Amino acid sequence: RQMKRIRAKQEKYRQSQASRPWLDHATVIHSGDYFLFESDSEEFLWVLGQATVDGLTRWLRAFTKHHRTMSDVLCAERYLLTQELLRVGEVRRGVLDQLASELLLDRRLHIPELEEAERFEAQQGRTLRLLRAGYQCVAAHSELLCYFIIILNHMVTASAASLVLPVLVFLWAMLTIPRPSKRFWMTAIVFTEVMVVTKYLFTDSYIKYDLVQLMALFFHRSQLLCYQPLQRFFHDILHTKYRAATDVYALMFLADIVDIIIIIFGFWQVPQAFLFMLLVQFGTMVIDRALYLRKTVLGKLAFQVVLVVAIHIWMFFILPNAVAQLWYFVKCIYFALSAYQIRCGYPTRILGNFLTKKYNHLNLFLFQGFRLVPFLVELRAVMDWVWTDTTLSLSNWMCVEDIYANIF
């Protein structure tokens, strides 16, 4: 509709111009006149603590809601089945109607005992519902903490043992069809078994976290309860487009800014070694702009598979540390979000600006914050001009990118 209206106006102004040949990019720019601007119709503390943590567990209710509905409908059908299960069980759809096929609806019977259990837990909304909803949270997400512990045993001094897990954690699990794999969990759990079995040349903190890694893996395994000639297949499956197609650029670059703050925080040997990482970090922070701006997905995948093993090879030669592994952990967020970006895959027709979506006072404060840091607004306006399809010069572009940023 917008492109329709714009072209319909420009044909109008090309009509009454003569009342077109040999226009050559410097006689179409310098042709503006007053007739372009006609008005054409314009078409004591305990209440604070209890209330704030009840709001926080309300936020956690909002996080848990869909697994909560799944659990509620399955426990309703469960208790109907068990109170049925006195003599026999022989039919599945025939017990689906003693109270329609593929929905998420709830228009059925109601056992008052289950309501009484809900009333009883409604008696104790002080701390019980809070940590109960926390357990329901980690049972609802139930997959992210597998990745969390897989990174978290690697951050505590695990040199080459738990390096082989996070590489294929990213590469397999976060790049595939949304139900991470058939068997990645199996080749996870057998390696995490034999990794602690082979720690028997006879460790202290590593096994102390690997037992948690095992039980988290089996926790997700039970909670899931459903189950060189092949790289090219699923790599093509990355380009079959069944995806939901959302994005996030705003958190990748934010995490990389936090990354560079961590590197600068590391200045109070390895300070001499920080700076090659700093420059190649800048190179990544440059090139991902172009990856986002040509709207290409294959280059981001190639950049992913290069960058993860490059930074993991750098996770050897730092040691000839705590801020360095913190830095490693904070860019694992960047790799995870990058893999999310690979999976959903760049919704079209969104260029915009990262902070200008609704004219709130918060937005205005954050925008004037963003234009305060040195070398950032003009770096954005230069790397935007290089890779986007435009027909102006460089200095003819920055007039637009300043008129806009003042009018906003």
Partner: protein
């Protein structure tokens, strides 16, 4: 008593120069925008900027449909809006 090193980098007469350099450069910086906002009035005191903002979102918009001859028939309207402030007052009114 001993003296830890304090004048070991300016030979005595090299801080009054440094301090007066600091105060001169930050003074004639800070008089940049607390006593010069007269010239940039006519680009900063518009009543209702919406007819600029629609056009500038259109120049942002066409850049992704790649109908690239439609930039330099809008960009002319923008530059000519900034070259004749009379027709900024003809274009930044209020509505009814």
């Amino acid at each position: 008593k001993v003296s830890p090193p304090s004048l070991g980098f300016l030979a005595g007469y090299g801080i009054v120069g440094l301090y007066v350099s600091i105060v001169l450069v930050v003074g004639k910086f800070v008089r940049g925008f607390f006593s010069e906002i007269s010239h940039s009035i006519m680009f900063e005191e518009l009543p209702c900027v919406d007819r600029i903002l629609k056009l500038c979102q259109d120049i942002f918009l066409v850049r992704e449909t790649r109908e690239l001859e439609l930039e330099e028939e809008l960009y002319a309207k923008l530059i000519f809006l900034y070259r004749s402030p009379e027709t900024m007052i003809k274009w930044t009114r209020e509505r009814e």
